[PDB]
Design a protein around this ligand. Structure first.
Ligand code: ADP
Ligand code: VO4
Ligand code: MG
Length: 747
């Protein structure tokens, strides 16, 4: 029989065992290679078939899991179950029909396994659980950058509002314009986290929604790498705005703006949409290299779609122009340059070249030109002149705070489109920025990856720990599955006083803060810690010349990442000098007013916000969608086996599949079940042990003895029995009577 043995790029390959040695099996893919006995797995007999639930495989192991997902992917089936957990592999193209209104209708009220695997089925299951258990629900959509979390979040939201309700759906282009950006991992990367709650009444009908937003990436506002961009809105506005709007806002091609021109200044466009962009909007880079290519994104088309979206959800033209005005104001702010004053003030002056930028910025932000000049080049502390570098920092700090408060306003404005006075329960969907790394990793990556650690820990806690504790408490005798927990990595980062975030905070507060001093402290205070290393020990050449006090490696659950620690101290400080806060809070423009040691910890904001979020998640029933990124090239039909296997492993899916060999995803109190059916029962079953009625019910419903197991207080059901479980659980008088009548006929 063919078996699975290791392959360095496919993860596993098919072969036959031709020989055996002390520590090896000899695998024929006349040619042979050696494999460890424990690295060789049985294969499914039919290599061309697939199963919708990996629990249905004859052999449950990482190799058969990988292959099943692969076969499905090759047939454009991106969704596959492991019991009630969904695996979604990014197709990197639009699969026809699978998100249609017809498809949506077909999933309504269907138990898991009665329809093909789909995000819609996870959404419907959350809805069903909310109704049956009278408990708010969370759907956690996890995965690395570019895996498909945001797309799947949108599908869930569309499903729920279309089935059980639209403005929640329609508002999305607005959030993405202000909070998403091109990174090298994802053309449409989310640079903020969100928890979107759909709220329901007692009849389980949608009454409104609420979007909680988290931790916008502020550094991106001012600078980007050459392959990356600022937030979409800048490019959508420059590409799509009318000439009247362009003139009023003094806009031009992106290369004319410091806050855009260190990044990629090319638009997403195709042959057709390029013709719709006016010549005066195109940068030299765009004219030379042409447009950026994407199946989803198009700067001109997205500007139009965004404006349509704004109108549909109730934003008036004044509101729209206000938003654009602040965006342009931030752009002109960035164009203000400073120079050495010399012995006059000892500080700096605005460059003569920056006169227009000062004028435009002041006009758009409702500020007096001189007030802005003074606030950027001096500070009362005595009114002292600032040095050029401090002026640069003042400018950028103001820009970041203005844009960030604008984003806050956008999210608030969105919430105002679907408000509700009261609700019974909610279904919330969590979409965070996912695990990411690059040639050069900084504090932004450190914070993003920390959040991903925390979320993986929640999965481990809910699915691998608590599940097994339940089986144990109920006396089920399910074989224990051991796994590598990541709490130690979390503690390295967030522990009081000694954790990296607190050591960083300590540095910000020292007389002479230093990235090197901070980095040395991290290594010194964490001698021998398993989750920390020095850059010279990196697996990658690019990191080998970083000094011990210039970086560190964190052994994340998803892989080791080497961080350069330059700018960690400055990036940890969210504070805005009162001079700048006062300037903007006293703007002559109402809209801008309504948006609104010197040290505020960014790291402590990551920790505090995540812990609040985790509190909310812990109070809800949780469902999980594990998004998988198939390759690093954003291409369709390119399944990178080893890459995908790595994700299945670190996400915990291999551990979960192991547990499911003998686990039970569905359960209820058998006393409560008996109590529910009691009023309809004939004396002959009413008199017997409550487990006996249950057994009679199960058998009448066609369940076999192996499908269920009675614990101490709860009855448990195996994977693939969700349909029968859902039938048993219905509390409707008609349905209870129906099933008892079936039992009566069975007897
Ligand atoms: N189900 C899908 N169908 C079509 N394209 C998809 C799907 N999921 C992801 N994509 C593509 O992959 C890109 C990245 O997906 P996204 O959800 O933004 O990733 P992230 O996990 O970072 O939120 C999308 O912009 C889109 O091009
Ligand atoms: O590329 V993502 O939306 O996980 O940040
Ligand atoms: Mg995203």
């Amino acid at each position: 029989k063919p078996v699975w043995a290791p392959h360095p790029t496919d993860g596993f390959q098919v072969g036959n065992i031709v020989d055996i040695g002390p520590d090896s099996l000899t695998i024929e893919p006349g040619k042979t290679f050696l494999a460890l006995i424990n690295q060789v797995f049985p294969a499914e007999e039919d290599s061309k078939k697939d199963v919708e639930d990996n629990c249905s495989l004859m052999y449950l192991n990482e190799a058969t899991l990988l292959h099943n997902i692969k076969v499905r992917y090759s047939k454009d089936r991106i969704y596959t179950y492991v019991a009630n957990i969904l695996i979604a592999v990014n197709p990197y193209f639009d699969i026809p029909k699978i998100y249609s209104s017809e498809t949506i209708k077909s999933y309504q009220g269907k138990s898991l396994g009665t329809m093909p695997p789909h995000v819609f089925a996870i959404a419907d299951k959350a809805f069903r659980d909310m109704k049956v258990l009278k408990l708010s629900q969370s759907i956690i959509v996890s995965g690395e950058s570019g895996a498909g979390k945001t797309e799947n979040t949108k599908f869930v939201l569309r499903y729920l509002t279309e089935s059980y309700g639209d403005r929640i759906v329609e508002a999305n282009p607005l959030l993405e314009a202000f909070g998403n950006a091109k990174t090298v991992r994802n053309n449409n990367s989310s640079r903020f986290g969100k928890f979107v709650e759909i709220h329901f009444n007692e009849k389980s009908s949608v009454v409104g929604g609420f979007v909680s937003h988290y931790l916008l990436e502020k550094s991106r506002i001012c600078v980007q790498g050459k392959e990356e961009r600022n937030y979409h809105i800048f490019y959508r506005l420059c590409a799509g705005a009318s000439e009247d709007i362009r003139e009023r806002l003094h806009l031009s091609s992106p290369d004319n703006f410091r806050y855009l021109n260190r990044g990629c200044t090319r638009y997403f466009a195709n042959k057709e949409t390029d013709k719709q962009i006016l010549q005066n909007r195109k940068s030299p880079e765009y004219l030379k290299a042409g447009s950026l290519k994407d199946p989803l994104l198009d700067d001109h088309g997205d500007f139009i779609r965004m404006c349509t979206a704004m109108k549909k959800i109730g934003l008036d033209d004044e509101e729209k122009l206000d938003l654009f005005r602040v965006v342009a104001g931030v752009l002109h702010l960035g164009n203000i340059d400073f120079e050495e004053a010399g012995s006059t003030s000892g500080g700096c002056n605005l460059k003569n070249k920056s006169t227009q930028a000062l004028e435009y910025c002041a006009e758009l932000l409702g500020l007096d030109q001189d007030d802005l000049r003074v606030s950027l080049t001096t500070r009362v502390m005595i009114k002292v002149p600032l040095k050029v570098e401090q002026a640069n920092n003042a400018r950028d700090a103001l820009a970041k705070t203005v844009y960030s408060h604008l984003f806050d306003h956008v999210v608030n404005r969105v919430n105002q489109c679907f408000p509700f006075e009261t609700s019974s329960y909610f279904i919330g969907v969590l979409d965070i920025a996912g695990f990411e790394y690059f040639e050069h990793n900084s504090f932004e990556q450190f914070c993003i990856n920390y959040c991903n650690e925390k979320l993986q820990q929640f999965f481990n806690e809910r699915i691998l720990k608590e599940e097994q504790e339940l089986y144990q408490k109920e006396g089920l005798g399910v074989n224990e599955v051991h796994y590598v927990d990541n709490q130690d990595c979390i503690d390295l980062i967030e522990a009081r006083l000694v954790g990296i975030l607190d050591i960083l905070d300590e540095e910000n507060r020292l007389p002479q803060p230093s990235d090197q001093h901070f980095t040395s402290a991290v290594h010194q205070k964490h001698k021998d810690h398993f989750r920390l290393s020095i850059p010279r020990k990196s697996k990658l050449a690019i990191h080998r010349n970083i000094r011990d006090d210039e970086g560190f490696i964190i052994r994340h659950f998803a892989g080791a990442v080497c961080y350069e620690t330059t700018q960690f101290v400055e990036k940890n400080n969210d504070a805005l000098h009162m001079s700048l806060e006062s300037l903007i809070c006293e703007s002559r423009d109402k809209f801008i007013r309504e948006l609104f040691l010197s040290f505020i910890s960014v790291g402590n904001k990551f920790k505090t916000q995540l812990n609040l979020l985790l509190d909310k998640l812990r109070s809800t029933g949780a469902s999980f969608i594990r998004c998988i990124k198939p390759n690093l090239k954003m291409t369709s039909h390119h399944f990178e086996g080893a890459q995908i296997l790595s994700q299945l492993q670190c996400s915990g899916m291999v551990s979960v599949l192991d547990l499911m060999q003998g686990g039970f995803p569905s359960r209820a109190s058998f006393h409560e079940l008996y109590n529910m059916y009691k009023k309809y029962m004939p004396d002959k079953l009413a008199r017997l042990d409550p487990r006996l009625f249950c057994k009679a019910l199960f058998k009448a419903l066609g369940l076999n003895e192996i499908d269920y197991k009675f614990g101490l207080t709860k009855v448990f059901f195996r994977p693939g029995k969700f349909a029968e479980f859902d039938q048993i659980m219905k509390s409707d008088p008609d349905h209870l009577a129906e099933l008892v009548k079936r039992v009566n006929h069975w007897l």
